[PDB]
Design a protein around this nucleic acid. Structure first.
Lengths: 89, 1359
RNA sequence: UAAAGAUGAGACGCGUUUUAGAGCUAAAUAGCAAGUUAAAAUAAGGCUAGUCCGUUAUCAACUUGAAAAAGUGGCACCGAGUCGGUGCUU
């Protein structure tokens, strides 16, 4: 299948992935990762996060309320290496 | 040496086994790679192995919890609506009231407001409870009285009526059609007389109201209700139904001749599935009966709660509850007086101690009503003056409560009555209650239908609801925001199961007309009738079936053999006495819907115009789907002019349940090209060869198998595996098998395999439930006969499990080819004879085998014997034929002496029987692998096949084993899963290579048919296109063919083809090859690791206690003050390597430990690992040194000693005993002396064989000795079975071998358990230490086991 | 002989934890009075905010650089006690 839900395969892939981000420490890629857990424990389908545009609309709507201040465009298109490496075509 | 290989696969219920063979039938070996921190860079492994997992349960407890959560959410929303109305005026009365009902749970020290909830000051609370004792007193004081009342108490009574509201079964208003007991009783007896017309029940002088609604006990009322009736037995059927309606427990076993007892009680939580289990054994025609008992029960209990007449007050329910309160008070005072006077040393133990089942155990303890009555019944019997109280206690009406379990039958119209009266009184004293009345009544009487579903916007995979505007659905604008036509349309297109033979269709309702024409013409077409001069009893003609279906079935409900022989033959067809061959004492199909609508319309011509079908089908499906009133009314408006008003108001209370399994397009949509007829047209009139549905499916001469076969095409993989049937463990096996196939194509260089062979084994046996039917079957034979045999020697249900004894009983003690009798104690000396020889077909059921005195009674030829038993035992065969001892087919097998020897259809039925796969799941599994492998497409868009997936009959390999002596002992080790994959892979390849004209049968593909009748030799020595004479297709593996008459012939050695001639089977090398392959030590074993999922803890709520392992149940409710749960669940384990404090020094020494992580604390762990571990009291925790360890991890110690991590504190054994073939043959020839089933000569030579090789016992004790000294490491139990091995050194073989096969549960893979010797019970030994694990190699393996990765836990731990 | 067979929608009723129903008389304690009802919770909770979702199905370790071209791991001989030895190629 191709939908990303609250599975057990999805949680092991995201745990593998949450070990990884401790290497890249001069950026801020943690808050986007906690947000993407936020949409995923509440029952949504985050399988439209394979396109880099959709992540930009979501991070802009999330910037509307004042959250996610420190995130540029330079961090995000780095972070989209990672839903094509772990899972994603 | 080859690059074209094959894969063998067997699929079980807890294992899948796999092997990779090449064309010379070896297993190729390779060097594979190891990553990690070891200097072991490559290891050799073989390409054979197994896979072992655990079974998964069903999705039912999940659904039950889910819908419970939905209902609690919606009840909280109704209370929020009501407070939202009263908020504004309540702000003028008292501001801080709803905050005082917010926080009434907490301890005083967390209360910010004042602690008394309603008024707040203590004088008005104490006065409020002294004036109105319960809630129902307050409700009666609102309805009756005429003052101006407070706003808060009106809010409390209306909240108490809107929170608990009653059931919604009686729809409409309360009228005596569905409220009085007597009309329901007449409905019960009219249902019963509608079922059993033969023995009618009169009820003319019966007043069921005065009898079933009196202040008496239960059994007295059952005796009176029988004692008004003219001669009914109290344990019949009708008395058991009245005893069902009162609430007693009958047994219906004596009424239908069941096998076990069955108790039913309506007041029990598992009534529905037990009623559905009873209705699965006596037919689905008994539904209205057991429903119409239950509605009668609700009428009785509802007449028992309302002990208040009308014309006094408008609130009956409240006055009934107050009356109950005062009776409870008075009887409590009397009981304390009598126990106070006469037994003064028991007054403390009943009225204070809440650990007994006394009075305080009923008020404050947790004991129910029934334990209270059974506690103080004899203590009342020891005293005087309790006669009234014993009358009440037998009436089950003593010391009751108001919130009891009987209130599940108070309908919502009674609460709606009290609410409506309260709104009509007060609204002249408040203006906003004059404005808001339909608002509140609409809050109470609102119930979401079935065809709307949950009210989602798109975060749920369970909804289908479509909107019309964009607002918030409240109770008031439900009918302005929700579009209901499109919602019902999606409800139909979601809630209907598809057709299994042909998708893109929907199935028929079971109560439709056309489906019952189908099953009636299905039953009529297979009946035969024998007449004088009709010695072959022929079938019916076309006009005969038309006359029988148009006279016997459109006039009468049920037809039995009496009106079959009498009411048509002795009326029109004018015969004398006609033998009726093929119906079992009554028919089984019927026409229910034609008699039901025949009752309703009270008309004839509209049922029989044959141009009104789809109207009736829309009516029937409409009544089947919905259970709403308004939507039936909507969907039947278009047929208004065809029906008058009373019948239109009489259709709409009628429903049906259940679905069939055939679509319409299957029955009357498609034809045959050679015929031009539908299937029902064949069932009406075929002429010569009248065949049923199962013979018209698989007829190769027709278009049907190619239309259905070509029409099954059938999105992702979980939809494919999801949308079919089967017990879900087999689906788990299918998914794992597809994973294994992709990785075996990954390893071997991505070349596509030439053959994949899949066999599906069975573990599905439940009980010998057909052997109770063998005892009862012999009772059918001898109760049919009535002879003098069971009066000499009866039957039982323990001896008949031996097949020699059952086949001894199946000849009525009479010898067959010798006119004498049979002795009971000569079971071993009575010979088994076969009619058709063993070299033609291998049939080992009841059908083929017959008993005989000596094995030289039928002559000397291979073919049929002489014709003397035909002329001597023809009445014997007749009354065996009627008594169902020999079946119809076996009696057709005993008559083979006449019809001209053996012909083409018999041998074509031998091969046709030994090829054709008929089960319906392997076909679809082969469609899964065939859809996944072959994707090469040609230029004409035809089928390019590169992969052949083949499935085989599951007895060929067992015949191979017992013939060529590769025996199988199941209790030794786990290597049989891979050996069976190996033998499937070999036998399938040889059988496809030898016979090229057998691909249309057992290769799944759209292939053409070849003539079986021309590819069979018509003579014995005829032998190229004529393949063989001897119809057993497994003969050429042998060297000497064997008949059943007394002749044994021979064959050549090298077995090749006769058309091209390629070498496919040799005799010399292959038994040494295959015998070498079964003897390897190293075979791949993989235990499949899992992560624990489920609930959080035990689901009971413990009281408050100052311990430290009670989980909190809200975020700021402390379990030292509020109580909570008990015992969590560990999900996985984690290895930690970091230094902690030593003590008051806070010194920094490293550790290496093992941690448990619960399910409640899993998201917080995977969100930040370093932060969570660093908050659990560590320091300097690293990143690369965090290792996740699930259940069933695999640790390698020294000398090949492996362990599997079963939990945080328990290990399991993980090695394997690889025992040579000679010991396996010796133990299997040694122990199975009970189920031999062989001729005594060569088996006597086998007794010489064990008599010569009687020292393998001592060798096997040496093997278990050194193996248990190498990996198992247990001493005292091993010495104990050595001494116990010394104290039984002189029994024969047939017990010592049994206790050696019982010895081998010492060295298995799995759990350490216990076992039994001859007499000594050897206890278990458990591992409770997880200390050695931390200095071992940790092995990571993929699914197959080939690609590994090792992590050395011995170096990591320092710096 | 084959052929139910899994999955989904609506609503009651009890069950269970805390608080409120002023306990009295005469250190430990004894004697007496009383008792049915109600409010809140019903897996901890989640946030692109719905009168939604939270126990089933599903899960080896590693992965920022062009496709049903590619995700990551050479091939043949002689052996056999849980897998060894050799050639060639690298």
């Amino acid at each position: 299948t191709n939908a990303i839900r609250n599975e057990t395969g999805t949680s092991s892939k995201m745990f593998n992935l949450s070990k990884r981000l401790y290497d890249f420490k001069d950026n801020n890629l943690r808050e986007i990762h906690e947000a993407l857990y936020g949409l995923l424990r509440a029952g949504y389908d985050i399988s439209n996060m394979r396109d880099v545009e959709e992540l930009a609309k979501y991070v802009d709507v999330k910037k509307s309320h004042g959250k996610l201040l420190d995130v540029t465009r330079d961090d995000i298109e780095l972070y989209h290496r990672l839903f094509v490496a772990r899972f994603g075509k | 040496m080859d690059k074209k290989y094959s894969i063998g696969l067997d699929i079980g219920t807890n294992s899948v086994g796999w092997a990779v063979i090449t064309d010379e039938y070896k297993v190729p070996s390779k060097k594979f790679k190891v990553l990690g921190n070891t200097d072991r860079h490559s290891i050799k492994k073989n390409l054979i192995g197994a896979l072992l997992f655990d079974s998964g349960e069903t999705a039912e407890a999940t659904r039950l919890k889910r819908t419970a959560r939905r209902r609690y959410t919606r009840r909280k929303n109704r209370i929020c609506y009501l407070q939202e109305i009263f908020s504004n005026e309540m702000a003028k009365v008292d501001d801080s009231f709803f905050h005082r009902l917010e926080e009434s749970f907490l301890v005083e020290e967390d209360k910010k407001h004042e602690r008394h909830p309603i008024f707040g000051n203590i004088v008005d609370e104490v006065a409020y409870h002294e004036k109105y004792p319960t809630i129902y007193h307050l409700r009666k004081k609102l309805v009756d009285s005429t003052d101006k009342a407070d706003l808060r108490l009106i809010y409390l009574a209306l909240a108490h009526m809107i929170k608990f509201r009653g059931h919604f079964l009686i729809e409409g208003d309360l009228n005596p059609d569905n409220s009085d007991v007597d009309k329901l009783f007449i409905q019960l007896v009219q249902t019963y007389n509608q079922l059993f017309e033969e023995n009618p029940i009169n009820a003319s002088g019966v007043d069921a109201k005065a009898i079933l609604s009196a202040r008496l006990s239960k059994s007295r009322r059952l005796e009176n209700l029988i004692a008004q009736l003219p001669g009914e037995k109290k344990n019949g059927l009708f008395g058991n139904l009245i005893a069902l309606s009162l609430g007693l427990t009958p047994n219906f076993k004596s009424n239908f001749d069941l096998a076990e007892d069955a108790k039913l009680q309506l007041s029990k939580d598992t009534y529905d599935d037990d009623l559905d289990n009873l209705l699965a054994q006596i037919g689905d025609q008994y539904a209205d009966l057991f429903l119409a008992a239950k509605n009668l029960s609700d009428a009785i209990l509802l007449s028992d709660i309302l002990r208040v007449n009308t014309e006094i007050t408008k609130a009956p329910l409240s006055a009934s509850m107050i009356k109950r309160y005062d009776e409870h008070h008075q009887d409590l005072t009397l009981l304390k007086a009598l126990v106070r006077q006469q037994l003064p040393e028991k007054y403390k133990e009943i009225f204070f101690d809440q650990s007994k089942n006394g009075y305080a155990g009923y008020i404050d303890g947790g004991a129910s009503q029934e334990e209270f009555y059974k506690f103080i019944k004899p203590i009342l019997e020891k005293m005087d003056g309790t006669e009234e109280l014993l009358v009440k206690l037998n009436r089950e009406d003593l010391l009751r409560k108001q919130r009891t379990f009987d209130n599940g039958s108070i309908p919502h119209q009674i609460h709606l009555g009290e609410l409506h009266a309260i709104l009509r009184r007060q609204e002249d004293f408040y203006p906003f209650l004059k404005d808001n009345r339909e608002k509140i009544e609409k809050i109470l009487t609102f119930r979401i239908p079935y065809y709307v579903g949950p009210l989602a916007r798109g975060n749920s995979r369970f909804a289908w609801m479509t909107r019309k505007s964009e607002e918030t659905i409240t109770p008031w604008n439900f009918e302005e925001v929700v579009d209901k036509g499109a919602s019902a349309q999606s409800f139909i297109e979601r809630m209907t199961n598809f057709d299994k033979n042909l998708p893109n269709e929907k199935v028929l309702p079971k109560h439709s007309l056309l489906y019952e024409y189908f099953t009636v013409y299905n039953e009529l077409t297979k009946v035969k009738y024998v007449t004088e001069g009709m010695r072959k009893p022929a079938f019916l003609s076309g006009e005969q079936k038309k006359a029988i279906v148009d006279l016997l079935f459109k006039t009468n409900r049920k037809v039995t053999v009496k009106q079959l022989k009498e009411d048509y033959f002795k009326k029109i067809e004018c015969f004398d006495s006609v033998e009726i061959s093929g119906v079992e004492d009554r028919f089984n199909a019927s026409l229910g819907t034609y008699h039901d609508l025949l009752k309703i319309i009270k008309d004839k011509d509209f049922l029989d115009n044959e141009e009104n079908e789809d109207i009736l089908e829309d009516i029937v499906l409409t009544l089947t789907l919905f259970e709403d009133r308004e939507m039936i009314e909507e969907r039947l408006k278009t047929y208004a002019h065809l029906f008058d008003d009373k019948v239109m108001k009489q259709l709409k209370r009628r429903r049906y349940t259940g679905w069939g399994r055939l679509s319409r397009k299957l029955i009357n949509g498609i034809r045959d090209k050679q015929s031009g007829k539908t299937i029902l047209d064949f069932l009406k009139s075929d002429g010569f060869a009248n065949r049923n549905f199962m013979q018209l499916i698989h007829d190769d001469s027709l278009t049907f198998k190619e239309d259905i076969q070509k029409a099954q095409v059938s999105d992702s993989l979980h939809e494919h595996i999801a949308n079919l049937a089967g017990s879900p463990a087999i689906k788990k096996g299918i998914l794992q098998t597809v994973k294994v196939v992709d990785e075996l194509v990954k390893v071997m260089g991505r070349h596509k395999p030439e053959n994949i062979v899949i066999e599906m084994a069975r573990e599905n046996q439940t009980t010998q439930k057909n052997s109770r039917e063998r005892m009862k079957r012999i009772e059918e034979g001898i109760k049919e006969l009535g002879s003098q045999i069971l009066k000499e020697h009866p039957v039982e249900n323990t001896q008949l499990q031996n097949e020699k004894l059952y086949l001894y009983y199946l000849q009525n003690g009479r010898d067959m080819y010798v006119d004498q009798e049979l002795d009971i104690n000569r079971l071993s000396d009575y010979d088994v004879d076969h009619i058709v020889p063993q070299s033609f077909l291998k049939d080992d059921s009841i059908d083929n085998k017959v008993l005989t005195r000596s094995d030289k009674n039928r002559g000397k030829s291979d073919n049929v014997p002489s014709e003397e038993v035909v002329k001597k035992m023809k009445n014997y065969w007749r009354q065996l034929l009627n008594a169902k001892l020999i079946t119809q087919r076996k009696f057709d097998n005993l008559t083979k002496a006449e019809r001209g020897g053996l012909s083409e259809l018999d041998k074509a039925g031998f091969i046709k029987r030994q090829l054709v796969e008929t089960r319906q799941i392997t076909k679809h599994v082969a469609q899964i692998l065939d859809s996944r492998m072959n994707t090469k497409y040609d230029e004409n868009d035809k089928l390019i096949r590169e992969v052949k997936v083949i499935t085989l009959k599951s007895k060929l390999v067992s015949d191979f084993r017992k013939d060529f002596q590769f025996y199988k002992v199941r209790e030794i080790n786990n290597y049989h899963h891979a050996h069976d994959a190996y033998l499937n892979a070999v036998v399938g390849t040889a059988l496809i290579k030898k016979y090229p004209k057998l691909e249309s049968e057992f290769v799944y593909g759209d292939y053409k048919v070849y003539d079986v009748r021309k590819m069979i030799a018509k003579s014995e020595q005829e032998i190229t296109a004529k393949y063989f004479f001897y119809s057993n297709i497994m003969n050429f593996f042998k060297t000497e063919i064997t008949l059943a008459n007394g002749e044994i012939r021979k064959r050549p050695l090298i077995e090749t083809n006769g058309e091209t001639g390629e070498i496919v089977w040799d005799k010399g090398r292959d038994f040494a090859t295959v015998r070498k392959v079964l003897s390897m030590p190293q075979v791949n074993i993989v235990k499949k690791t899992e992560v624990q999922t489920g609930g959080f803890s035990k689901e009971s709520i413990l009281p408050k206690r100052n311990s430290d392992k009670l989980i909190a149940r809200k975020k700021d409710w402390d379990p030292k003050k509020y109580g909570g749960f008990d015992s969590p669940t560990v999900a996985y384990s984690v290895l930690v390597v970091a230094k902690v404090e030593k003590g008051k020094s806070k010194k920094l020494k490293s550790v290496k430990e093992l941690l448990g992580i619960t399910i409640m604390e899993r998201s917080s762990f995977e969100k930040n690992p370093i932060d969570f571990l660093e908050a659990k009291g560590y320091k300097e925790v690293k990143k690369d040194l965090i290792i996740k360890l699930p259940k069933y991890s695999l640790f390698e110690l020294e000398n090949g000693r492996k362990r599997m991590l079963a939990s945080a504190g328990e290990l399991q054994k993980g090695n394997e005993l690889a025992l040579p073939s000679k010991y396996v043959n010796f133990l299997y020839l040694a122990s199975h002396y009970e189920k031999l089933k062989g001729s005594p000569e060569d088996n006597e030579q086998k007794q010489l064989f064990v008599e010569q090789h009687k020292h393998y016992l001592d060798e096997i004790i040496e093997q278990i000795s050194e193996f248990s000294k190498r990996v198992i490491l247990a001493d005292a139990n091993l010495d104990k079975v050595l001494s116990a091995y010394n104290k039984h050194r002189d029994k024969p073989i047939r017990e010592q071998a049994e206790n050696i096969i019982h010895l081998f549960t010492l060295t298995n893979l799995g759990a350490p358990a216990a076992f039994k010797y001859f007499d000594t019970t050897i206890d278990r030994k458990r591992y409770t230490s997880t200390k050695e694990v931390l200095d071992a190699t940790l092995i990571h393996q993929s699914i197959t086991g080939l690609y590994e990765t090792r992590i050395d836990l011995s170096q990591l731990g320092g710096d």
